[model samples]
Target chain A: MRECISIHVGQAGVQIGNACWELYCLEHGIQPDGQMPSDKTIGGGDDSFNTFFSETGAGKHVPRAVFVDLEPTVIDEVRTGTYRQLFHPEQLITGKEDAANNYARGHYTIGKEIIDLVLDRIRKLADQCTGLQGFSVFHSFGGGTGSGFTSLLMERLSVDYGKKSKLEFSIYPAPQVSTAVVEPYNSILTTHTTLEHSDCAFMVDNEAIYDICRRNLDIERPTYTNLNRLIGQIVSSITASLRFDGALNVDLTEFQTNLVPYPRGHFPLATYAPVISAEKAYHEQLSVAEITNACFEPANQMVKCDPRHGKYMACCLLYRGDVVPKDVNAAIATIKTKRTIQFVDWCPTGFKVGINYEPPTVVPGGDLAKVQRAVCMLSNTTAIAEAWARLDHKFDLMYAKRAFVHWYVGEGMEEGEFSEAREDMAALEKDYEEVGVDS
Target chain B: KQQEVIADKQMSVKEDLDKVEPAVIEAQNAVKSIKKQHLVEVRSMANPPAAVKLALESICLLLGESTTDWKQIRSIIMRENFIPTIVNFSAEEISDAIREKMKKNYMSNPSYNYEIVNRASLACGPMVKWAIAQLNYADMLKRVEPLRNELQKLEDDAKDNQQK
Candidate 1:
């Protein structure tokens, strides 16, 4: 009876929410209006469907998800979209004005208007859950609303749901495909605020995912539709064990137990396998071992970092679709033989494997290959410190010259807050270094 | 035709369950009365545990079984080695039996008797590793005991309601 509430915070969060719900609906065989077809059976998947979807007396299914945005435009698209009926109106919340790509505005001024309503809606959702495991929050770290409003929401969630685990999928700042020039500021500030509040965070960089799309998926120009669907697939892959019956039942909190060795070392690098193009799928017949090996490859990683340069503290390989125990054993044996996969000398075998019988399905017309097997690796490798290092460098370059300082100060933030947040991020990078150092 | 299809899938699952249910019950029954003593003995395993041996022999009546090979990796001890070491070593209980035996022998011939036996002193397993692991969760279990009891009560109520 352990259920989770999914909270999508801003523009990236809401759009990702749309992509996720679309895939979830397809997988669970629920219609756009949240009703099953007359011919379909109740037990199409597992009895754990109630964890994500609540059934009404009138037999309509509603997602146990809340979509919050400081602006209406992104959320309004969801309201007008095909899966519009999948959520209750209250669950789809928005404020009148946007955060205008400013963290201070989202956190203090404009975000205050709808923070209470979003909290209340989230409370109603949590109150509905019998055994509320925790919350799975989706948001981009670089945006104003996603950063500041999420920071606000996260503080409240920590206060109210003190014991509940809060897991996040954050879109990290990618300077190459940069949305805003001040993203590093937003990213660092958001990271500092949510650092203590969130239990485990799986970060994905736009640059890395975009590279995968163009190079692997063979898309000349990939849109957000294409990108979010891929992100949706990875999100779905990670949560599959919880949403369905599996050989190993991994609870949300178990993610903390397995991946997170210490409190500060909570950011785990995520990688998904078989990210092949449609045309390439015809030429390639990928094996379980092939995908398993591919997952360790830096190219398959959602965040760009050279794991070889750092040490691994823990790893949990979550496999969905056609996979078995023996194949998993053989794959691990092969991985053990590799020198590149270095673990900390202190931790004796920080490895875990999970298998969900249900295979993943791609969104219709999506560029991702429809493969029989897939594996998503969540590893707490110190290499993810590189992402923080990269962001911190950019934050430094801006803060040193004091460029874009007044925009935040004008919206009720102190200059000291920037210094404070940046310092905390520097310490976080140092924490990873300490964790990697041989004791 | 759809009805038949549903029935066929249902029947197939039921047939598999029919094969599974009895073995599951048997396995449950085997584990039900298991104590730390049984598990420790299983770990030592000069011979296999009686319950598992009995299960395997029963299976052999239907199919067959294999000869036992008692082997340890004999080199670097990793987590697989340490976890079982922890489980089995922690499985040990303090024996007042030793004290009682000492007392009885002393009554017959009173000389002197006092002995301190740290389980670690025996030196059979990785005591240093075990001690560190114990310290990690020492207070955690204490804090969660009440929550565990509450969980038990909730589960009992659920089971009771279902039966009704």
Candidate 2:
């Protein structure tokens, strides 16, 4: 079996690597001038050098990195550990002098230089790793440099490694606010192109992180560290999911079997679901019962029901390896049931239920009607009824009657509103008699 | 051929079950619709500026004169003082205060800036009146609570959701 090695590819990865080195040096009592800066500092280079240094405790994990479309100043900052100099840079594909002139004219090149740099580094690192360990590629979506270069580099690496040895990639989709308008379009195009080869991509919308930073830290000027910390926390979380021994209860089935890598953006939602569980629901007055009831409620009432719309419910099922067809069916069943109780959506971890209702029927209730009604209307004439009888000799008219009544009456009645009026009773009796409820 | 036969049988059974499933779903949905229609709708009300100032002052009095630092005062006003007091105030009281103090200030300063000095002395006239009328302390309070709660929830949720 080939030992899996992790590779992190992104502008942030290089910057983070540099930040880690600076932090590492500070912690380990190592001076910058003492020995040649380790392979970690170089981003990606001689694998033998890395292995030797890592074995000897002279080098930290290289965290194989490639920076594309970054400014020389940004590259220098990564190389030298001066954080402030790193800025979003323009990308150029070829002809640096011409590209520089183009950049001066406010036209970006989507630079080829960084792409080549990334490929060169990947080849060198791949040669060094004798064993096959997987690689992690991280890149941002906002600027021309991070967007254009990261995609090109990943494609090159995929081609070199071939289909079987291809790396699993993750993208940190850019923040919403851009320094320029073209940056977002460039990012979106780069992502679409990259998705062809990469296994899964995660989006980290900048607006979400920015709002998080501003409200939490009270720091208006969010630094790279703030962004790195958020991303690093996500990476560390995934790593823990893969390696951690505690509880060991999380479903790892999805992770174990598939080459389909988990998308980066989905991770935060996935990991957060269990933590926000039933208890948080209680505090928010969104108990499971409340959630269930809310789902079935009209959209308008759900929206108008809560002031500040301070209502949200999220459910996720985390399983190990690839989910079986049965598991998927079960999940769908759960979601159907949930929709009957609350406003729910398919979320990364499992499903999300929210009270931010805009009503007037966004979700088609017709589908729910079709599924629920048919089952309730079943009678002895139904083939399913015969099958049920054969499955159990004790399954007589009583059981059939009960099942029909339960489906028709229990589920049909509005929450906390059961009517036993003459007309309703007559209808109920007719359904039961037709279904062979009373032998 | 045998595998195909088995697959065909399984598919037929599944298809039948799928066909039957919808009616049951519909019954459930009808129930859901009624429940949804009855759920309470809460509408937020906005409070006037004079009411906001009076509440702030009343809260300061309740907390005692010595404990009244601007930060503490602001916190007290936000949490305990302003919203509850203003929510209790009638439209007539708020209107009277605006007409008497705010109108004069609005006339004097055409820019209608509501500096603390101008608001306190009734110098800015109708601009002051308009500012007080549009203050909407309830809306401010409503917005602030969610923002505060979301940040707190994120922190707590992050802690609880730890992987290791």
Candidate 3:
């Protein structure tokens, strides 16, 4: 009865939702039309499929997901995409005008215009669930619609469903391939607004995913499709415990309870392993030990940060497919010997483990290879504070010259918010530092 | 305020080590470099030898917080004569390992003996804190050789003052 409604906001969120649902269908044996073939029945512990899908009156399964944006082009693509029938038209909500790359416009103008309609659709989806657990939100931290509109929506969610834990999958801005110079402004503002509303948030950095696609998947030039598919694979690993039977059953709320020591310390670093290239897949032998080791390696992390330099507050090792407890124990035993890995001395029971019997699956024509076993590590480490520090510095650099401050002010935003948001982020960095200390 | 002053002095000592003697940092990193090398070698091998596997297990056990029997520890050392592999490291490497061991000790709330009678008069909080602080201070002390000599002379002077 623990149902979770997926909400995809902005262009990046909508596109990644498409890839995630597509992979979800393949794993559950559902076709593009959301129907099972006559030869196959809903078997192999697919009882939890209803967690993400609700059945229609016509005997077809439809995803309980809402896609919203302040513009039409991206949602229009989803409306006519290959699996258009898999979603209801009403589930796709959009505004008449875009936010024009301004966080102020998204939060104040266009976002306000569509908030009621979007909330109505989400309420309808929630009504279908007998025991609704939480909301899984997808957005980008650097965009106007994704950052601003998603923050507004998060506030409304806290008002309406305060107890239901809200988890976020935010595409954190990558400095090397930044789209706009004002990205730091949008990122920090959104983080400040939604800091308390969100229970836990996972960051997916484009720069890090691009490197993985190039090095691990052997893609010379990776597009959004390549990056989103890999992102979808990781998202699937995170939700696998809720969607299927696992060694330790953990739902959305329990995940938050374990990883989030402090409400402000909700950002956790995620890493996925067994990301071998298709050409190299055949010769590669993946044992539980190898993939487990790969999870701690920085090359496989979804964010570009050095975990070795920080102390971990909590860690969850979610294993998928064909893994035994014996090997997992031995692998962790070996990892404990490493000098680089350190945890805070204050917290006991900081480590949690789970395993899903279903192995990971690769979409056809995707860059990643199919692997029988994979591990996704979600750890709350002080290392992620380095990302915030970097972003805050960039914000300071731009704010010092008052560069492009009028764009937000012109949209009726107050000037004081710039200072307030920057101060909050600085405090967050200090909080991380304090929590990392031995005392 | 006193804690802040202590941290400031600690930072100064670390900076001195970094600027005056980069070799200390090298030795600390070399500890990581060799560990990474050994892990990669083990991962690449299709099947590790029995002795190699046992040696690896023994090291992890010794380093880990989990208690192992002295009999097994003695047997492992006798069997692997290469126990010196871990022993043959610089002062900082040993200090770093000991710091980790102490952290684990403090994390689990350590006590010398396990008994209801031994649990009386609970005052181990500051004891553990001071112990870890001294351990970390000693780790930094090893990094700066000149600081070590100066601290030794200060200790001798303190002894003379006590005699006076």
lDDT of 3 by residue, A318-425 (tens): 777777778877766665566456777775334467766655555445534456777777766654556667667777776678655545544435445666787887
- CAPRI quality band, candidate 1: incorrect
lDDT winner among the candidates? Answer: 3
Query: Of the true interface contacts, what fraction does each candidate have?
Result: 0.00, 0.00, 0.00
lDDT of 2 by residue, A31-58 (tens): 3323434434311122223222222123
Cα error, candidate 2, residue A362 (Å): 46
Superposition error at B87 for model 1 (Å):
82
TM-scores for chain B, in order? 0.28, 0.22, 0.26
Residue-pair clashes per prediction, in order, are: 0, 69, 0
Q: Between 1 and 3, whose lDDT is larger?
A: 3
> Candidate 2 falls in which docking quality class?
incorrect
Global CA lDDT computed for model 3: 0.57
The worst-scoring run of ten residues by lDDT in candidate 2 chain A lies at A370-379
